[PDB]
């Protein structure tokens, strides 16, 4: 031990966009998130509950129209995606909270 043992410095969350346009690939991938609090924070539980309500979807799920989650349900009936998943990624004092989806070029807007 002794000298040469540093801690972790906080990481500024920015909030921006990176778009890698590539019309050669057949389905678009999009990932959007706000800054979450870190591992320690008590409120990761309420976030996970809300995320669960939104849930996830995939084109192989049985139950389309009748799924509880309105996103899932509207996505299945209107065929707005191939898959989507909410997430709550945790790091020291920060995190990414949001969702990721995969869809046809003409469905990115409705999906968002």
């Amino acid at each position: 031990d002794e000298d040469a043992v540093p801690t972790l410095s906080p990481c500024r969350f920015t909030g921006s966009q990176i778009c890698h346009r590539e019309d050669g690939l057949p389905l678009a991938h999009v990932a959007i998130a706000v800054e979450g609090p870190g591992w320690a924070h008590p409120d990761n539980v309420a976030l996970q509950v809300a995320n669960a309500i939104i849930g996830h979807y995939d084109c192989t799920y049985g139950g389309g129209a009748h799924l509880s989650s309105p996103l899932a349900s509207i996505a299945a009936t209107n065929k707005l995606c191939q898959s989507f998943q909410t997430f709550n990624i945790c790091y020291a004092d920060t995190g990414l909270l949001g969702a990721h989806f995969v869809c046809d070029h003409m469905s990115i807007d409705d999906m968002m």
């Binding site: 920015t14 909030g15 921006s16 966009q17 990176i18 778009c19 890698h20 346009r21 590539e22 019309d23 050669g24 070029h105 003409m106 990115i108 807007d109």
Partner: protein, 75 residues
């Protein structure tokens, strides 16, 4: 017509952007700003300016000839 998603084919182009709430609306406004307007001016004077002075001149001469004409010495 038109729409988005049916415009044209684009590949291999990344676009980094930043939220409007994280950047300034007027970065080097006077610093980079004024040099640019001077540069834009240089680029265009020789194409915009001349026609106009030709009129400016034709205007002042045209007025002088007219007013000086309604006067007369002998005969």
């Amino acid at each position: 017509g038109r729409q988005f998603g049916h415009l044209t084919r684009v590949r291999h182009v990344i676009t980094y952007s930043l939220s409007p709430f994280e950047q300034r609306a007027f970065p080097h406004y006077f610093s980079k700003g004024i040099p640019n307007v001077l540069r834009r001016t240089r680029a265009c004077i020789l194409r915009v300016a001349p026609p106009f002075v030709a009129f400016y001149l034709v205007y002042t001469w045209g007025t002088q000839e007219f007013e000086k004409s309604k006067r007369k010495n002998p005969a």
